[PDB]
């Protein structure tokens, strides 16, 4: 046979127990003798030791912790196959083992309080400030890095309820409404929020302080 | 090489753009010959047809839209090498597609009241009543099916305030402090929560009303 072996990839934040299986190496040299298989590489004989290892005789490729995707990303492995002997009955297998990403991290704001402000006379449209929260988590390839902003309540209410408004993906805040006036309500607090997976994940929260100018 | 396949594992819910590169298809074969690649199986030339796809001269297997874990979650599928002369250079490649999970689903109480009953003298850590939330995803493997229970809050507050217990993975509400009384108290709303990833995903709420016996 003359196929590449592909990669191997191993969700992180695994659920107990461990040591748990990942995948079975065998040589079908072991229609003619015994086989004992082995591991190298950073990750299983070189530090990181012991994150992974393999049973000598069934070939068992045995994960012993739970991954995380933000501390390694990727190893780097090789598979071997020996006889009674000592000796190779194959080169040594390719085990590139790729950790795929998992929710565990929560979204956050770069700060618990940010501040802007906005001429009252401005058009509705306009752009005012701009929040941001960041996850640690991929956003390329998943949704699990990937934050929606909402706005969650505004005080006060006065001319009404709905006086800005948040792009979901940008953070950037808006006003939507005619009314604003310095004199009579010369600043908003907003709480606003962002909620990773693109909206269906979790929920964290700040406040914008809004100044209105004259 | 007589090393056996391992199967490849694709997260769910994958982010665009599609398609997108898995693994590239490789017979080694190819220093020697020109070769032609293709794959079959359903899931490629079967229903469900063109979700996988192989670009012929590079081997580059591509998944072609999101895969969805609680939908499929396996495909079987084979890798052909075939040379410009017609001749099939390798036995097919096992293309084993383990699709891992996701928390694409929020946990869900199995009816939004929960009604139970208990008798008022009984002895601090009595069972009252399980309440059951499901969730979709995976909790063998991972924690994005397994549900948390918790208490949000008792109404009333009398005599005490923390008067019942629920088991954070049974769903058992228990009682856990003297001073029931069906003439003071007759019964209560708890108002109850199932958070999945065990606790650190998302919560969906519930009400248990429980009558006091006498
Ligand atoms: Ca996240
Ligand atoms: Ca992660
Ligand atoms: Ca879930
Ligand atoms: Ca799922
Ligand atoms: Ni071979
Ligand atoms: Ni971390």
């Known amino acids: ?13 695994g659920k107990g127990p461990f040591p748990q299986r990942l995948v079975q190496l ?12 082995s591991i190298t ?17 069934t070939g068992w490729l045995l994960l ?6 933000e501390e390694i990303a990727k190893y780097e492995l090789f598979g071997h196959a ?4 000592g000796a190779s009955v194959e080169d040594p297998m390719n085990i590139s083992i790729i950790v795929t990403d998992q929710n565990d991290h929560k979204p956050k704001f770069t700060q618990d309080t940010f501040r ?13 400030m701009q929040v941001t929260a960041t996850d640690e988590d991929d956003a ?6 990937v934050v929606a902003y909402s706005i969650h309540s505004q005080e006060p209410k006065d001319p009404h309820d709905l006086m800005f408004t948040i792009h979901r993906s940008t953070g950037t805040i808006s006003v939507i409404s005619s009314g604003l006036d310095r004199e ?9 929020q962002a909620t990773d997976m693109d909206g269906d994940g979790s929920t964290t929260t700040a406040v914008a302080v809004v100044e209105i100018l004259d």
């Open 1 to 13: 046979m003359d196929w590449v072996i592909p990669p191997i990839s191993v969700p992180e934040n």
């Open 26 to 37: 065998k040589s079908n040299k072991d229609r003619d003798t015994k086989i004992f298989y």
């Open 41 to 57: 590489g950073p990750g299983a004989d070189s530090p990181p030791e012991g994150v992974f290892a393999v049973e000598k005789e």
């Open 64 to 69: 012993n912790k739970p991954l995380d995707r």
């Open 82 to 85: 020996v006889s009674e002997n």
């Open 116 to 128: 802007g402000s906005v001429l009252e006379g401005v058009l509705p449209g306009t752009s005012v």
């Open 140 to 145: 390329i390839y998943t949704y699990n890095g």
């Open 184 to 192: 009579k309500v010369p600043e908003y607090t907003l709480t606003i």
